[PDB]
Amino acid sequence: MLAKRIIACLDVKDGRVVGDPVELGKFYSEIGIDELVFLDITASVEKRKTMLELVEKVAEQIDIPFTVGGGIHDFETASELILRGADKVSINTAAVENPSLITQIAQTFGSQAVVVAIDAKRVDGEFMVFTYSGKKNTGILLRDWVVEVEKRGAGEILLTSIDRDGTKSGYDTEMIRFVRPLTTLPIIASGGAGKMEHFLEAFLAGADAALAASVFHFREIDVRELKEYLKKHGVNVRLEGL
Amino acid sequence: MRIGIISVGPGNIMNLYRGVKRASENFEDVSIELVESPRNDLYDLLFIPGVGHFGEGMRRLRENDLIDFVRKHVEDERYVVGVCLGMQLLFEESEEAPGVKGLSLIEGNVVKLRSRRLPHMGWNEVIFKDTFPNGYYYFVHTYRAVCEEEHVLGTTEYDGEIFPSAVRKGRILGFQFHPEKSSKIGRKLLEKVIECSLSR
Ligand SMILES: NC(=O)CC[C@H](N)C(=O)O
């Protein structure tokens, strides 16, 4: 049966994890991470070709899917990074400001290739969509954005609950449930994970995958131990063996 | 061991190349060539990869004269292995390409999956009848093959529906998932495929 995905997120800069990103991702593949996601913070002048060598390097040695993002602002950018070897790109601001960008990506490289990143926040009792690294209220309802995202062709939603991010308070399972019946797109929860229990919850709320950053890198949760755990609580995950 | 990987076909083919190259690391005399056109001689192992629509598949083969080439490979009992869209092209016709004829190398047809969440994207579990190792491999597809049981090699289940995630007819092999993106178990499968073609 289909496995609940455990996704790891690395921040890159000048081709370096803010180790060697190819190195660490290869190691994450050997310990049983299901997918990698690189969020890129290189300056503005350098981003273009740096993001290209990153993809170029990762794609030479990684044996699992990987997503690239950070400041992917147009189709040209999206196009060079996919033709370079990235399995998909993530778009957020440029997705909201220009939703045909999603269809241009989906139609050219397949829906598989577009991960749309949504950052919602509860405002006046509503789930509202924010852009510019969580800094602008677009005044667009999550519910409205989630349906449009599917309808435009995207393959997946990376759903981040702004306020939960960094808290260790757990995933925004209320947000997940609100989003859950609204779309058939696989859902990735991001921001809040602190302990193995939290993964279960997000999965029970109907998330298709769970993403984390530090806790994986800095080792509060074990990938191996996280899955067997999850496995013990009725969640169907991928589990190597030896 | 002369290995071919057809490089015309749509979508990314280099990951397959890179993983086939990885899988072959420990073998003697490994040559792995990107095949864009028919060659004077035949390979020992010929890969047909693919990501995209069935029609593009056949056309990039046809435009480049690879139908007879892939065909002459079957006539001389050489290993031919379809990967993702490649597996589907191995069949006769497909719902995804209403007028378009497959290689028709294995009997059957291709049909849309039954789920409301298409494509079937992510890690799903493959069970084989032999040879290849059971476990989780990474998938991305909206369509599925329909063949007789004597041809089913590997089984998968997605939202209740059981379909061939792998197929086989003599030296013709087809895989639906992406070995190149299925981690350690994916090399393992790829090594095994190579190992099959070391034999005759
Ligand atoms: N993703 C692919 O291109 C695989 C083959 C086919 N187009 C499908 O979706 O089933």
Short mmCIF file of C-alpha atoms and ligand atoms in Angstrom, two decimals, chain A residues 112, chain B residues 50-54 84-85 88 96 119 140-144 176 178, ligand 1:
data_model
loop_
_atom_site.label_atom_id
_atom_site.label_comp_id
_atom_site.label_asym_id
_atom_site.label_seq_id
_atom_site.Cartn_x
_atom_site.Cartn_y
_atom_site.Cartn_z
CA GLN A 112 4.62 15.63 -10.82
CA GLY B 50 10.04 7.54 -20.55
CA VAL B 51 8.10 10.20 -18.67
CA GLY B 52 5.19 11.82 -20.56
CA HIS B 53 2.31 10.83 -22.83
CA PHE B 54 2.09 7.57 -24.75
CA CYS B 84 7.79 3.93 -16.50
CA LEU B 85 6.30 5.05 -19.85
CA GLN B 88 3.44 0.97 -21.29
CA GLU B 96 -3.76 7.86 -23.05
CA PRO B 119 -1.32 10.22 -10.72
CA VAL B 140 4.47 8.35 -10.85
CA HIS B 141 1.71 7.36 -13.29
CA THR B 142 -1.91 7.81 -14.18
CA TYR B 143 -2.17 4.67 -16.36
CA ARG B 144 -1.77 0.92 -15.88
CA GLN B 176 6.28 0.76 -14.03
CA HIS B 178 11.43 4.36 -11.32
N1 LIG C 1 4.21 9.65 -15.77
C1 LIG C 1 4.33 9.07 -16.98
O1 LIG C 1 4.60 9.73 -18.00
C2 LIG C 1 4.11 7.57 -17.01
C3 LIG C 1 3.23 7.05 -18.18
C4 LIG C 1 1.83 7.68 -18.38
N2 LIG C 1 1.92 8.99 -19.06
C5 LIG C 1 1.05 7.74 -17.06
O2 LIG C 1 0.89 8.81 -16.44
O3 LIG C 1 0.55 6.69 -16.61
#
